[PDB]
């Protein structure tokens, strides 16, 4: 059907924030198909070719002082500015995670109970999920599916714990997240 | 590091497709509808706390296209190499019979940014309530994309996310069913 060759051009301006507005780094990147050809790193202060293909542009743009002056001031007028515009609903967006504990629908072991700690619908993504057995943090046997970004400003993750359950034992899943002042806990009574 | 804001744009020939969007820590803040010439916020709430001059994205896209053609010529018309997407289907929360949920079709690590996605319920196309995001940037310069299907779980239904991309020899079907 359609076999014509494609040609792609991408331009990315990345503003990197450390300790909020304290330290800011601007990274301007030009990508042809899948290769970055030229970039402006505010830490360098000028355009630099990433590949042979970008040399003419790095040279040409660096000969335009107005341009460089503008790009050098962008960490303030662009990056710090946009950070201020969205901070109230980006940097400070908070959505508490829903937490539940249940046995895995799959138990591939003998006298072993694989426990699942499901943590979903939260924001931001930084989160800490840890298991405990009678107040003692479980190191080994733990396995996570990793942080899953849903594309709608929410995350989810499953953190399993293999166990050799004995009546009376209390297995706790602890969740620390910026949305709550104190850890969220869900216990499994074995 | 703590946070990253990205203004990402692209133009693709010969499809003539273009995109302009802002990203915060991997999530889309907004993109610009090139045809309606207006800002489309990822979440409705955003449009009440901030604004953006959409017509300005169009100025950039015109420069992007001009530059694409200069680069195409400068590379002796080296076309892009297709890279097929990794496709994954998941729910946005633990599934429970008869309790409303959402099927998420995650299309990741691919290029060029042109894909055809279809949801199938028992082998039949579904167009009810589905939604999708635009193409999202990746550090390796490939793309990501999300397609959504709100549904009511039941052991009676089976689903498939059908993905087509030039990097794939055949349409890819990612199946999902209760359990």
């Amino acid at each position: 059907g359609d076999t014509r060759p494609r040609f792609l051009w991408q331009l990315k301006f990345e503003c990197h924030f450390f300790n909020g507005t304290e330290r800011v780094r601007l990274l301007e990147r030009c990508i042809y198909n899948q290769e970055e050809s030229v970039r402006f790193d505010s830490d360098v202060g000028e355009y630099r070719a990433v590949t042979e293909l970008g040399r003419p542009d790095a040279e040409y743009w660096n000969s335009q002082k107005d341009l460089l002056e503008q790009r050098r001031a962008a960490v303030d007028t662009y990056c710090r500015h946009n950070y201020g515009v969205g901070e109230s609903f980006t940097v400070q967006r908070r959505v508490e995670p829903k937490v539940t504990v249940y046995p895995s629908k799959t138990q591939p072991l003998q006298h072993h109970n694989l426990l699942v700690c499901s943590v979903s619908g939260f924001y931001p993504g930084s989160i800490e999920v840890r298991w405990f057995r009678n107040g003692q943090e479980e190191k080994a046997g733990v396995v996570s599916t990793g942080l899953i970004q849903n594309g709608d400003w929410t995350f989810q993750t499953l953190v399993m714990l293999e166990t050799v359950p004995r009546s009376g034992e209390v297995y706790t899943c602890q969740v620390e997240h910026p949305s709550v002042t104190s850890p969220l806990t869900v216990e499994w009574r074995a | 590091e703590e946070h990253v804001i990205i203004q990402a744009e692209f133009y693709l020939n010969p499809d003539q497709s273009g995109e302009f969007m802002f990203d915060f820590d991997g999530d889309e803040i907004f993109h610009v509808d090139m045809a309606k010439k207006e800002t489309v916020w990822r979440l409705e709430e955003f449009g009440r706390f901030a604004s953006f001059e959409a017509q300005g994205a169009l100025a950039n896209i015109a420069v992007d296209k001009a530059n694409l053609e200069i680069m195409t010529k400068r590379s002796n018309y080296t076309p892009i190499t297709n890279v097929p997407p990794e496709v994954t289907v998941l729910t946005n929360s633990p599934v429970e019979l008869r309790e409303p949920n959402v099927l998420i079709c995650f299309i990741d690590k691919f290029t060029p940014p042109v894909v055809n996605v279809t949801w199938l319920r028992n082998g039949k196309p579904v167009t009810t309530g589905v939604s999708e995001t635009v193409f999202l940037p990746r550090e390796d310069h490939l793309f990501r994309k999300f397609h959504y299907l709100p549904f009511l779980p039941s052991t009676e239904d089976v689903y498939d996310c059908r993905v087509e991309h030039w990097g794939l020899d055949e349409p890819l079907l990612k199946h999902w069913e209760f359990d």
């Binding site: - | 203004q7 901030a50 530059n67």
Partner: peptide, 13 residues
């Protein structure tokens, strides 16, 4: 608050 965009520059022809 209004987000601002960075302007794209023409490449060397």
């Amino acid at each position: 608050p209004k987000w601002v965009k960075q302007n794209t520059l023409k490449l060397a022809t």
